[PDB]
Structures are given as structure tokens and as C-alpha cells.
UniProtKB/Swiss-Prot annotation:
Similarity section: Belongs to the SNF2/RAD54 helicase family.
Protein name: Chromatin-remodeling ATPase INO80
Tissue specificity remark: According to PubMed:10574462, widely expressed. According to PubMed:16298340, specifically expressed in brain, liver and pancreas.
Naturally occurring in which organism (per UniProt): Homo sapiens
Upper taxonomic lineage: Eukaryota, Metazoa, Chordata, Craniata, Vertebrata
Domain statement: The DBINO region is involved in binding to DNA.
Localization terms from the record: Cytoplasm; Nucleus; Cytoplasm, Cytoskeleton, Spindle; Chromosome
Residues of the full protein shown: 1168 to 1216 of 1556
Note: Although the ATP-dependent helicase activity displayed by the INO80 complex requires INO80 ATPase activity, it is likely that the helicase function is carried out by the other components of the complex, RUVBL1 and RUVBL2, and not by INO80 itself.
Length: 49
DNA sequence: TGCCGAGGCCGCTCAATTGGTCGTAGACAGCTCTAGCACCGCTTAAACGCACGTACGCGCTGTCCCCCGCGTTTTAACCGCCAAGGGGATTACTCCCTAGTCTCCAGGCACGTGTCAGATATATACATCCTGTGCATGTACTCGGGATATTG
């Protein structure tokens, strides 16, 4: 049902296991990488096909 | 110079108040009482309030005559302060005991009536006690002089 999830990277970018998402959009970006890497790899992980 | 070190602005997360919504349980408002006994209306023969010079009692008044007030300033320590120290008032936790609930259960006594008496009120006669008045001394007072106590 739910088309889109809205997150802030520091709140939702860790641990969350959002394997249901086909795609990721950053509306803005932080001065520090690694945050975004976590935010992406909490979709991109072993559960996906 | 350098470096950097120290420096100054902005999203999480938690923790009281605040206000909102849920549902349910006696307790409030109201009805009909009904029922009855007080309020009323209606007389009566009743007490006690009240509008009203005058005798006159004292509240208020025109005088002079003095202490305590009124004014000054030195000082004197009273009272305020701040800062430090010690503990004891305080806080937060864990174990514990009973405060509180309900429930059953009885009879103690506070409740109520049933009769009718020793009580106290009211009158008349009255004597007596008590008030208001008038009337001596006896003291408690104000003063002066000296002894004892106490402050500086």
C-alpha cells in the first residue's frame, strides 16, 4: 500500500531494514559522508533480490 | 609565520504540565406525594409602647498657670552585613506493617411512647430588709531630711 517513506537521515538511517524500497531519494545531503552510505545500505542489503 | 585551540551557532530525546476523550456510578433533581400539622384568618380581651412641660443635672464654657513637651548633638553600641563550617535536614530506595474494605453478627442503648405529680407559677397580705441619707476619724498621702545602695 505505502508508496513512500519520509525520513531524516540521523533518525531513520540506522538499523531499520527497509528492504521493501526499490529506490532512494536524497532531497538534501550532509557535510559528512558515511551517513548517506548507512541510509542507502539500510535499503540495499542481503534481504533484497 | 605557522598551527590549532579555543570559540560561537543549530537538530535529537527525555520529562513535566495540559488539555482532551471514555465510560460508568452512584447522588441530585424532581415527582408525587397525602400526609399533617403548622400558617393563616378571625375574633377576643387583653400590655405595653409611645408623643408629650418641666424640674433641674450636668455638659459645656471664659478665665489664668505652669510641666512636659520640643529642640540639639554626642555618642554609643545596636544592628546590619559577609563568609565559612558542620551537620542535620533531605532524598531516594527496600522492607515492611497496618489502614482500610466488607462482611457477618448482637445486643446496648438511644430511641421512642404512656401517665399524669411534684413541681413552680400566680395572688393577697405584709413585715422587713435594704437603700439613701446624713455624719466622725483615721489613714493613706505628700513633703523634707538623712541612710543605704550602685553605678562608672
Amino acid at each position: 500500500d505505502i508508496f513512500v517513506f519520509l525520513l531524516s537521515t540521523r533518525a531513520g538511517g540506522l538499523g531499520i531494514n527497509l528492504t521493501a524500497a526499490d529506490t532512494v531519494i536524497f532531497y538534501d545531503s550532509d557535510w559528512n559522508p558515511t551517513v548517506d552510505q548507512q541510509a542507502m545500505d539500510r535499503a540495499h542489503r542481503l534481504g533484497q533480490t
